[PDB]
Amino acid sequence: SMAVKSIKVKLRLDDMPEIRAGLWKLHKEVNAGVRYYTEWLSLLRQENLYRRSPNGDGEQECDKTAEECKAELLERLRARQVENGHRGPAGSDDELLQLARQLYELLVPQAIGAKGDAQQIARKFLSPLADKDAVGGLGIAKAGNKPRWVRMREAGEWEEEKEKAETRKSADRTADVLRALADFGLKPLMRVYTDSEMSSVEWKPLRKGQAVRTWDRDMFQQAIERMMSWESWNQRVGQEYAKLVEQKNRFEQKNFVGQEHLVHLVNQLQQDMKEASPGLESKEQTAHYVTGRALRGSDKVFEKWGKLAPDAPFDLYDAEIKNVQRRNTRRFGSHDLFAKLAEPEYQALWREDASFLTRYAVYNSILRKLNHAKMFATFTLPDATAHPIWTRFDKLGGNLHQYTFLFNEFGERRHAIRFHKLLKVENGVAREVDDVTVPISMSEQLDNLLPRDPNEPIALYFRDYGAEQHFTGEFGGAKIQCRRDQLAHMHRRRRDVYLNVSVRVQSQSEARGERRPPYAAVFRLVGDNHRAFVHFDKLSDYLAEHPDDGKLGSEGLLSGLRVMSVALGLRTSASISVFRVARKDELKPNSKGRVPFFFPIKGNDNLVAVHERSQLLKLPGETESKDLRAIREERQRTLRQLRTQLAYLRLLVRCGSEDVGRRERSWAKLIEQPVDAANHMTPDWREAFENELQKLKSLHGICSDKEWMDAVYESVRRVWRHMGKQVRDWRKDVRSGERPKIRGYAKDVVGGNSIEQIEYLERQYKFLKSWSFFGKVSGQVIRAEKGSRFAITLREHIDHAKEDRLKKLADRIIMEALGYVYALDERGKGKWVAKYPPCQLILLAELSEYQFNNDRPPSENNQLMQWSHRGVFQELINQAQVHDLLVGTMYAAFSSRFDARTGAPGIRCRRVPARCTQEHNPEPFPWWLNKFVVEHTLDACPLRADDLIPTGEGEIFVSPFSAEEGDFHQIHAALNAAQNLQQRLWSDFDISQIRLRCDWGEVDGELVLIPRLTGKRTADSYSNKVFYTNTGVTYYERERGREKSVVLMRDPSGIINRGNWTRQKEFWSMVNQRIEGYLVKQIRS
RNA sequence: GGUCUAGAGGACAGAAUUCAACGGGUGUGCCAAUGGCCACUUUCCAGGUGGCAAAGCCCGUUGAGCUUCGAAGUGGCACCAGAACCGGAGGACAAAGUC
DNA sequence: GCCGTTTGGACTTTGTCCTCCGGTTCTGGAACCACA
DNA sequence: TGTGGTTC
């Protein structure tokens, strides 16, 4: 309900090692206590425990079976009866096992599917289970917080709330289980950890009537928490595994019921390639099974195969596969699969049903995921070093061991933390102490915290650049943390210790006592994806109640109604456009009186959405220039040299193979061509590689096998030991190298927080991994060892690089939404200024389904991980909670392929750079300019500057503007996609207005396309309608309601095919003809 | 100034372009930002492990020298965390088949 | 023809190791009454 | 604004 934030603080423990040792001892004690109670709960559960399987990661073993638990549980219960001196009934084994299971389901209600409060369960049971004289859980004690009906009776009147206490107390089996434990001599079931032989700490003596310390209550709660969440996963994993088995059986008899002979044929196929595979021996059940990844682009190959003869030779089938791969090498599948599918014995898989293999690929993915799906969640006890939990500290006034944050205890910014209870270790003995004041290391992050009330040392103020008034906040719970790397170690040194303080920050809306900001009732956010929908009924009154008054920054959220759409990307991290809800009674802009761009709003005809500003929120390093382009090439010069040198080293190693026909085909690739025509290698190493080749050329065929192979391996050592020194010097220049470093603020940097700089680091890790695992023996596999770590310092740097990019991206988006701009003065040199009124809503693209998938090529998956847009989406929701900013998503299908102003479909294009058209020393063409010139054969055509090149992936969106051939509307692709999200917000857009999936069928005697009713919007418009044709390309609607489905497209602007419903294939070829076909024809002249 | 609208911090192209003392401090990190030496890992490179060492770092002041108008400038940025878990995919190695 | 993204290299199959990205389930309390 | 057992 309230924004919580963690500020990690470091403790200066240099001048007091007796307290540093006490904190470490306290950390070991709390982990040992949690492990004691967690182990007790696992025995009361008396079910199977599963652990991580060694000697192979994947499956899971049975660490402790149920009979082992029940046997060990009974050993403790019987020994406890003896320890309590029980003289009454001992109870049978089955009675004690049922009582223990009952108690477990009260401690962890998630075991049976119920809900449980970890705070209140641990408070309710620790004393009744560990205090010898406890009366809690029963109905005897008069203490405790008054019930909810007693609070109403005294103020706020009662009748129904006193009934709910009784009917809930009737179904409360706590009193009977505790009395059943008492009758069996188990009145103290477990032991208080601090008051037992397990702890060697000399704790403060127990008070009268005290048996449990505050430390034990911290331990017992953390044991219930980890137990509850794990039990919730046991139920969740079991359910999701059961749904998989149902998915498998509900799929065979619902997809290919009458297609049984094809299933037997593809099984022969999957085992045909299984035997004829020269790769590694198969071990998985689904090995060589037909997957969707291997069938990538099979739709194009099958249509091109249908236009052939079944008895035709291979090459015409094979060259028809090569053409599909050449069209785009990235979105292509397996050549060998299509090579075997062209064989006449397997042609029936794609000839009869052209969609069978993709259906069966889904069935194979269900088979593989079912073979790896777990049935139970692994159970791992806490460990002080391996799997640590952290000792908690309640705030001042809490019920646990508390702490105060001391502002300026030793200086201007020298803060301190006073632990009211702690441990102190002097000459090996651990001793509990009181009132320990510990200074804090300097933290500029702590400068955002200011004390609020002297009488209450919990209140604070919270600073923020995007808030003119500081937020009111309180200190919360804290936890003592140590570094994970300084944890498994022991040594004999005096280990940094941190305190992780939770800060609860109150937003400006929450400070006024409102559940939600007043503009929250205008925007409906649905689901976890925060799908945004506008209450068009209510925004006419909101503008009357909240008129624009010009207040900037965080002071203008209650005046006006603005929305900022964001288009995330890789070249530019964020592209934004701001719109304002205003009456159509407007006027001309300040500059040159050009009517402002606006969108109509559904429902309200008096109100529109006026465009305010559009910007590219480029993180540092996302710029480009002549000098920047050169430095970025030089920073990877030696790296790209060593990468290609390694590729030719492996070619030389294959020449030393024991397989005649491998070394001969490999030795052919070395002597047939020159070594480095592209000059990608270093000069000196290339010369050494040429010497060994010409040396082996004077021995090939002349010498014997075991004498030639011996020379090949000796020439590999000389060249590998040579390149080894090159890799050594390269790394020396990477860590210790003296490259220029920025001072102060500066735009146009080398890498900064750009995707390229992170991949510049990733490229170094990929090569070093390839360099260390490079094998000098041909055919040997070298993988990492079962627990090794590689490039620890570089890997942590790449992760810290992505973490810093993610947080700075979300902050830029929010600072812009709030209306703040970081501007330079050179007399102040950069300062956040409130320049614009704020936006109450940040509109993102709904991309929850754009996840990593095996169907996508591994490159496209790699980009999605570099991008990590879902991480940007979650970081925005976190940082926006304090600023009362709403973050919502919009249906993003075809957001970048349709015009935001016109509505006509378009093509992403690039413009020719002037480096390639200047007559004085022209630079070579890029990759996209070459592919475009090759497709249309424009070698003798002179390109000009800023020539549009339709590539389908550029940063410039081009759409036809009218029937005039060449009349184009050009705009930034990311900003067009950003404005499209805005246009869809105010019009209540649905994909059914542009795209429709249909199936053939009979309705009124003629063959027509029946549209698929997906969602209530599609059913509201096209349920009673149907589409007919005369040519098969342009469809028209009626009013009555092959085997594959047909997708219909529509131009809302009426420019392409007069906005009639068109088949998807011909529709986009018409868009291509009016853009690509025109630009190509004009270039030819 | 050329190109392109959204008319804005507009967008693409172009032309243009650091020491030294002393004092204080070193939360987690990034910005061209990945520490150094020695030893061990059979062997040289990579990677790992251990040890050692001084610091390297910022902030302030006083001096120097740079570089633009005697004055100014020689650092900026972001930060919601903890534990366990279940998934989703990458990376590397070898063989084979492919633009 | 491809929703969303768009890198120099791109693509598939087999097994086995290290890493990263995404999402779940718990958490980072409150308050009364006898104490001596 | 105590703690420690106890109830919400």
A1018 CB contact with strand D at below 7 Å = no
Shortest CA distance to A99 belongs to which of A60, A136, A73?
Answer: A73
Say how far A261 CA is from B98 C1', in Å: 30
Residues A29, A11 share a domain:
no
Q: How is residue A187 written in tokens?
A: 């009145």
Write the DSSP assignment of A163-193 as a string of letters. HHHHHHHHT-THHHHHHHHHHTT-SS-S--S
Asked if A480 contacts A393 with a C-beta cutoff of 8 angstroms, the reply is yes
Alpha helices in A698-791 (DSSP H): 705-735, 755-772
Residues A162, A68 share a domain:
yes
Alpha carbon of A644 to those of A181, A731, A770: distances in Å?
73, 17, 12
For residues A700 and A943, give the distance between their C-alpha atoms in angstroms, rounded to a whole number: 50
Say how far A915 CA is from B13 C1', in Å: 9
Strand C nucleotides below 7 A of a protein CB? Answer: 1-36
Q: What is the dihedral of CA A982, A987, A988, A993, to 10 degrees?
A: -110
Residues 373-402 of chain A within 7 A of strand C, judged by CB, are: 392, 394-395, 397-399
Q: What's the distance, Cα to Cα, between the start and end of chain A in Å?
A: 66
Helix (H) or strand (E) segment spanning residue A915: none
Shortest CA distance to A45 belongs to which of A91, A3, A101?
Answer: A101
Asked if A830 contacts A746 with a C-beta cutoff of 8 angstroms, the reply is no
Shortest CA distance to A378 belongs to which of A787, A33, A59, A114?
Answer: A59
Instruction: Work out the number of other CB atoms within 10 angstroms of the CB of residue A920.
Output: 4
Domain span including residue A694: 626-736+748-803
**Which residue has its C-alpha nearest to nucleotide C23's C1'?**
A870
A411, exposed or middle or buried, with CB in 10 Å at 0-12, 13-18, 19+?
Answer: exposed
Number of domains in chain A: 5
**Which residue has its C-alpha nearest to nucleotide C17's C1'?**
A784
For residues A730 and A721, give the distance between their C-alpha atoms in angstroms, rounded to a whole number: 15
Asked if A873 contacts A311 with a C-beta cutoff of 8 angstroms, the reply is no
Identify the residue whose tokens are 């102060």: A744
- If DSSP codes are grouped into helix, strand and coil, which group holds residue A967? coil
Residues A840, A760 share a domain:
no
**Which residue has its C-alpha nearest to nucleotide B75's C1'?**
A744
Residues A554, A500 share a domain:
no
Residues A166, A58 share a domain:
yes
The answer to whether position A271 is within a domain reads yes
For residues A178 and A130, give the distance between their C-alpha atoms in angstroms, rounded to a whole number: 12
What are phi and psi for residue A859, nearest 5 degrees? -65, -55
What is the bridge-based pairing of β-strands A841-846 and A562-568?
Answer: parallel
For residues A721 and A715, give the distance between their C-alpha atoms in angstroms, rounded to a whole number: 10
- If DSSP codes are grouped into helix, strand and coil, which group holds residue A472? strand
What contacts A1028, CB < 8 A, 6 or more positions away? Answer: A1006, A1008, A1009, A1035, A1036, A1038
> CA neighbours within 13 Å on the CB side: how many for A453?
9
Strand D nucleotides below 7 A of a protein CB? Answer: 1-8
A155 CB contact with strand D at below 7 Å = no
The answer to whether position A361 is within a domain reads no
The answer to whether position A371 is within a domain reads no
For residues A237 and A939, give the distance between their C-alpha atoms in angstroms, rounded to a whole number: 60
What is the bridge-based pairing of β-strands A598-600 and A607-617?
Answer: antiparallel
Say how far A947 CA is from B3 C1', in Å: 9
For residues A128 and A554, give the distance between their C-alpha atoms in angstroms, rounded to a whole number: 52
**Which residue has its C-alpha nearest to nucleotide B4's C1'?**
A970
Say how far A752 CA is from B76 C1', in Å: 12
The answer to whether position A978 is within a domain reads no
Asked if A573 contacts A619 with a C-beta cutoff of 8 angstroms, the reply is yes
Helix (H) or strand (E) segment spanning residue A67: helix A66-83
The answer to whether position A255 is within a domain reads no
Q: Resolution in angstroms for this experimental structure?
A: 2.9
For residues A207 and A748, give the distance between their C-alpha atoms in angstroms, rounded to a whole number: 67
Nucleotide with minimal C1' distance from the CA of A736 is: B35
Residue type, A120: Q
Strand B nucleotides below 7 A of a protein CB? Answer: 2-18, 25-36, 44-51, 73-99
Residues 214-243 of chain A within 7 A of strand D, judged by CB, are: 214
Residues A403, A503 share a domain:
yes
Asked if A594 contacts A588 with a C-beta cutoff of 8 angstroms, the reply is yes
Say how far A521 CA is from B5 C1', in Å: 34
Shortest CA distance to A46 belongs to which of A81, A96, A117?
Answer: A96
Shortest CA distance to A467 belongs to which of A834, A2, A6?
Answer: A834
Shortest CA distance to A867 belongs to which of A821, A941, A802?
Answer: A802
Identify the residue whose tokens are 């050169």: A630
Q: How is residue A1034 written in tokens?
A: 């342009």
Q: How is residue A761 written in tokens?
A: 């680091």
For residues A542 and A521, give the distance between their C-alpha atoms in angstroms, rounded to a whole number: 9
Say how far A76 CA is from B81 C1', in Å: 38
The answer to whether position A132 is within a domain reads yes
What are phi and psi for residue A574, nearest 5 degrees? -150, 135
For residues A1001 and A999, give the distance between their C-alpha atoms in angstroms, rounded to a whole number: 7
Broken C–N links (> 2.5 Å) in chain A, after residues: 157, 494, 1041
For residues A306 and A322, give the distance between their C-alpha atoms in angstroms, rounded to a whole number: 16
A453 CB contact with strand D at below 7 Å = no
Instruction: Work out the number of other CB atoms within 10 angstroms of the CB of residue A36.
Output: 21
Residues A455, A341 share a domain:
no
A362, exposed or middle or buried, with CB in 10 Å at 0-12, 13-18, 19+?
Answer: middle
Among A868, A891, A914, residue at a domain's last position = A891
Residues A193, A70 share a domain:
yes
Q: What is the dihedral of CA A162, A168, A174, A180, to 10 degrees?
A: 100
Among A851, A869, A891, residue at a domain's last position = A891
The answer to whether position A993 is within a domain reads no
Residue A971 CA, chain-centre distance (Å), reads: 30
For residues A134 and A141, give the distance between their C-alpha atoms in angstroms, rounded to a whole number: 10
A744 CB contact with strand C at below 7 Å = no
- Experimental method used, please? X-ray
Asked if A816 contacts A617 with a C-beta cutoff of 8 angstroms, the reply is yes
What contacts A967, CB < 8 A, 6 or more positions away? Answer: A960, A961
Among A206, A239, A272, residue at a domain's last position = A239
- If DSSP codes are grouped into helix, strand and coil, which group holds residue A1082? helix
Nucleotide with minimal C1' distance from the CA of A1068 is: C1
A858 CB contact with strand C at below 7 Å = yes
Alpha helices in A743-895 (DSSP H): 755-772, 792-817, 858-867, 869-880
Asked if A919 contacts A867 with a C-beta cutoff of 8 angstroms, the reply is no
For residues A125 and A181, give the distance between their C-alpha atoms in angstroms, rounded to a whole number: 12
Residues A541, A504 share a domain:
no
Residues A782, A851 share a domain:
no
Residues A758, A712 share a domain:
yes
b/e code A196-205 from CB counts within 10 Å (16+ = b): eeebebebee
Asked if A582 contacts A607 with a C-beta cutoff of 8 angstroms, the reply is yes
Residues A771, A660 share a domain:
yes
For residues A540 and A533, give the distance between their C-alpha atoms in angstroms, rounded to a whole number: 16
For residues A622 and A569, give the distance between their C-alpha atoms in angstroms, rounded to a whole number: 11
> CA neighbours within 13 Å on the CB side: how many for A85?
1
The answer to whether position A1039 is within a domain reads no
Contacts 24+ apart (CB under 8 A), A48-53: A48/A376, A49/A379, A50/A376, A50/A377, A50/A378, A50/A379, A51/A378, A51/A379, A51/A380, A52/A378, A52/A380
Alpha carbon of A972 to those of A614, A869, A897, A976: distances in Å?
10, 20, 12, 6
Q: Could you tell me the sign of the dihedral formed by the alpha carbons of A647, A651, A653, A654, in that order?
A: positive
Residue A147 CA, chain-centre distance (Å), reads: 44
Strand partners, A392: A479
Identify the residue whose tokens are 């007559």: A919
Secondary-structure percent of chain A, ordered helix, strand, coil, rounded to 5: 40, 15, 40
Provide the residue count of chain A.
1085
For residues A142 and A967, give the distance between their C-alpha atoms in angstroms, rounded to a whole number: 85
**Which residue has its C-alpha nearest to nucleotide B46's C1'?**
A772
For residues A340 and A337, give the distance between their C-alpha atoms in angstroms, rounded to a whole number: 5
Contacts 24+ apart (CB under 8 A), A239-243: A240/A373, A241/A373, A241/A374, A241/A375
